[PDB]
């Protein structure tokens, strides 16, 4: 089913068996990007491929803040993701203008999804070539993790995984007992699973950080990195 | 993978294996242009450009592939020059409609982020092609330090210690990997730039070439200036000499 | 002959990284007759290989040397309808200067603006780009003498002298010979009209007239046409140094 | 100089001796409101307000004459309260439509400058009156340090070490002149604030953090420290 | 201080001693209207209104000075009734153009804040007068608990444990100060309301009067309902009796 | 001529003897503000301001009656400060929406001309009052030399060698008439400024005062800077002494 004739050149075009091929292709732009995962506070990690030595450190970043209290973790076509981050930024801001406090992640996800989906109907554009996840903690709402794909679908999650191996990395998170564990524990078990899955970057948010989504300090990375390298040998 | 049928005539069109071919092609408009590079000393940033004397008849200070965007920001461009000049205008307005409101200079981080927004905007849609140019922005102030950014046709903003765009991307980047840029002063770097241009330049297939050069640092108050002719001719000479070898 | 697809829209990069529909627009300039412009030390001079396409014509129709302002002259090659429209754009642009800013427009900038504009037609599928190159030349005393050339792709180039059309190539190697930085404008008009006659194809093109342009300290800053004395005299000088 | 004929009914009307009376009157709407003050420690800024229990029936945390505008900015207001609350909304949006674009927090310098722009806008025109309120904005981060600003009805933004708006402006300012605010820590200051409220109050309290003390967050002052500082004021009063 | 000359004909006009008289006058439109009050039990909120039978000819459930704004929000109004009804509409839209987007119910805190924004908007300008009405909003859900707010003509939103607007503001508020509202259940309160209406009512100068009454609490799921006739007539009776 | 009836309440109203009184009144808003002056050396321009320490409690570098509008332009203001700050914003945008397009710095001639346009715009109409402030703009580059301009409420732009706005206009101007400003260097001038502030200042009726001071020249690259504290305190002292 390299279906396509015609059927796969526009988002404005259903295939006969009932499929918008140009979206599926947008999803395959996520597949060809490196793996990145997130798991419930909430923790994100990313298989960030040192494409060069010449880089800045803290360029590149595939873990954003959208707000103070929200983090974004992206996979696929990075230019697009950054623009979608901007959209989330505005959306969570034009909240606080009016409604006084922080935006609920449920809803912010719902909105930015609205937006992503908007690009799947029409012939004058292609859809976005990126998935991403949003993660937040406050105490009123608890811990929350969401994932949006190119087709514009917002999914709540206990943990998930996007990119090169989606598939491998998800079966590995199925193993863990995420509901129980503390955030401090998890960062290890993340970095494990990146290294497991990698074919031969890290993110807080929780009660652990006040509600602030921070980067993971270098102590804990290097230590958790090491723990991954070691439980690898096996 | 001359992929394309259909899949490579619009920016509105993903290939099946998940690729916007018309952007990649826009990137290959940068490749066919001459090399240009930029690189971050500890007290600032330096740009140089393999500027191919396409004629003798030219003005000097036409041609220029090193702009000021502001006083304190410099732009260094490669690929399709008409496009770049327009993108420069966009950066100009953006860094201006800053100072109107926000009072002082624009942060390079952000300006890059904005002009990137813009470049990316041309990658989604069928009624245009994307821009056929990469470029780099460099600034110094003392509060922010030295800063170097590179945007490509696909609209991605990258921070850098040094980078290189055009004919040899590839050769010129492996040569900057050698240098110890974090340490060195800007005054030193201008030499080591002009070396690498001359290293990488093709004597055979490209003809004669001039060389264009760019300051910004604590060395120049924060002002992005052109490099005075003393220092060019001297650094040019140093390149010619360490070439023979 | 790349093209399939790749060459029917300005909205379409070729795979090897090329907007073919612009290059084709440039080839509309090539098939037009030669025209050149060249910077003396006290000003700028334009000449045009204006092919008497008929005897029936008005004189001072046809004109491939415009005024855009008082102080700016335009010299065009390729698809003439387009050029005339671009002239209008330059006219407005240099005018909506003086409204506000009080004095004359700087050529640097005017060129930069009209270029902006030409380039605007190279990105999009609902139009083709302009099928014409042209040069702008001015003098004042504050700015000195200035010469610019814009091509279809929307690139503004400063120049000491340049040449657009049938032979670009021949006519440029001929201006390389001259010592333009030194010479006075009065001298140059000769050496122009020489080079038109040098380059002109006697065989394949038929008869031809010649059109000619001042601007310098020689003319106050005003871009004028070259008076008929100096044409017929410089025309003659070309005819003579031809025989050789 | 009850000047006015004509000269004092519009913001569109200069008096002959060169005065926009309708603004000065808007300032006198601040005077008739209760006192409120704010003052810059070395590690942050502190606000207090002579909040007159107009009733027992109230909510607690209604009424509030100390807002958050952002997380990191606090507002402290005096005069005509309906207006202030609307100006707070303006500040809110302004500091938000920052973070949308420019990525981080808004600089207080500038936010003040903006919201001032806005207040001044109401002073020129005949179809409106100007705002009947002064207010102060206070913030801390570490990059910018501690910062305190005051805008009045006429739309003027002033930086300050400490200031005071309302019933006694005048009394309360001469009292802050005494203190050594540049030196002191924020923890110390809250006392010396609440003192000065009680000094100035006519016999015949709400409180505000921001500093390194609170991460950069403008919080309300916890009840420990109020009741303790309140007590300290009551005591050094007797004298 | 019948101040006014000039100073009191526009909302665009500060008095010299620093006062927008035309708002204070709008507040005095509330005073000349009959009393109405609202008061926060621990499991919800209750409203009652001294509704003056201006005629026998009326519909019953015309007149109504207790609205629903939403399902879960109730409004209780005093002063100039035409205005109030329009402000209700504004609250209606505002709490609706919530649920469109944000999914669930509107928080009373905020809805009050918004509609206040709006009321205040009418206090600045010369081409209008402000609204001639106060009102109170009351809601319960379980997440937010019980909530009571009051907005006056000047556009100020106040949170409350209980309050009172109209003929006697003053009398009725001192009476609610007596009660222990934080403790009591909603079922208890409705009595103690209807008491205070009857206490405050002027037997001499006002004639006969009906009584209107309002639920919201855990008692009603979150729904603001009218108080069923059992409980009115029973609480009405209890008021009549503790009167004597 | 307290003329006014009618004639002096609107900018839309000529007096019968031919006068827009509401502008003249706007000018008298400048008079009641403290003095500030500016004066053109041969290598640049210098501003100083009789800045009345209205309190001890202030920030230092609040208050500022000397702005940067650009890097290369400085503004010095007198009268109604809220207005001035808004006019500064206008100048800021205007000199910015230059560099966007025209590539380099804005010419002071023109910037003044523009912002003036604007100030004048407020003198015709009944729905506004004009601005209650004068100000001066000063710049140096090498191409244009040193330049000093003053705009008053009526919207008139004036070039100057030196000028003075506020409490004593009059005193301070007769004092600058003394100096030989065309000759002198900027370094010299800052003294002679701060002299004239102190000369003119009223010791009786105004209390203490600070002093604010402003560079621009070849002395500072073209940058308008504040005057470093060395040179202030030293020039302040020189003023105090030649006072006695």
Numbering used by the authors:
A (entry chain C): 1 to 40, 44 to 203, 212 to 245
B (entry chain B): 1 to 245
C (entry chain A): 2 to 245
D (entry chain J): 1 to 204, 211 to 245
E (entry chain I), F (entry chain K): 1 to 244
According to the publication:
The proteasome, a huge protein complex responsible for ubiquitin-dependent proteolysis in eukaryotic cells, is composed of a 20S core particle, which serves as a proteolytic chamber, and one or two regulatory particles. The core particle consists of two α- and two β-rings, which form a cylindrical, four-layered αββα structure. The α-ring is composed of seven homologous but distinct subunits, α1–7, that are arranged into a hetero-heptameric structure in the order α1-α2-α3-α4-α5-α6-α7 with assistance of assembly chaperones. Among human proteasome α subunits, α7 exhibits a unique feature of in vitro self-assembly into a homo-tetradecamer with a double ring structure.
First, we determined the crystal structure of the human α7 tetradecamer at 3.75-Å resolution. The α7 tetradecamer exhibited an hourglass double-ring shape, which is consistent with the previously reported negative staining electron micrographs and small-angle neutron scattering (SANS) data. The two α rings interact with each other mainly through two α helices that are involved in β-subunit interaction in the 20S proteasome. The conformations of the individual protomers and their quaternary arrangement in each ring of the human α7 tetradecamer are essentially identical with those observed in the homo-heptameric α-ring in archaeal proteasomes and the hetero-heptameric α-ring in mammalian proteasomes. The SV-AUC data showed that the α7 subunit exclusively exists as a single species with a sedimentation coefficient of 14.2 S, which is in excellent agreement with that estimated from the crystal structure (14.4 S), confirming the double-ring structure of this complex in solution. The mass spectrum of α7 under non-denaturing conditions exhibited ion series indicating a complex with a molecular mass of 405,879 ± 81 Da. This confirms the homo-tetradecameric structure of this subunit (with a calculated mass of 28,284 Da, based on its amino acid sequence). Although a detailed comparison of the inter-subunit interaction modes was difficult because of the low resolution of the present crystal structure, the model clearly shows that α6 makes steric hindrances at the inter-subunit interface, thereby explaining why α6 is not able to form the homo-heptameric ring as α7 does. All these data indicate that α6 interacts with α7, disassembling one mole of the tetradecameric double-ring of α7 and thereby give rise to two moles of the 1:7 hetero-octameric α6–α7 complex. In summary, the present study demonstrates that the proteasome α6 subunit acts as a breaker of the α7 double-ring structure.
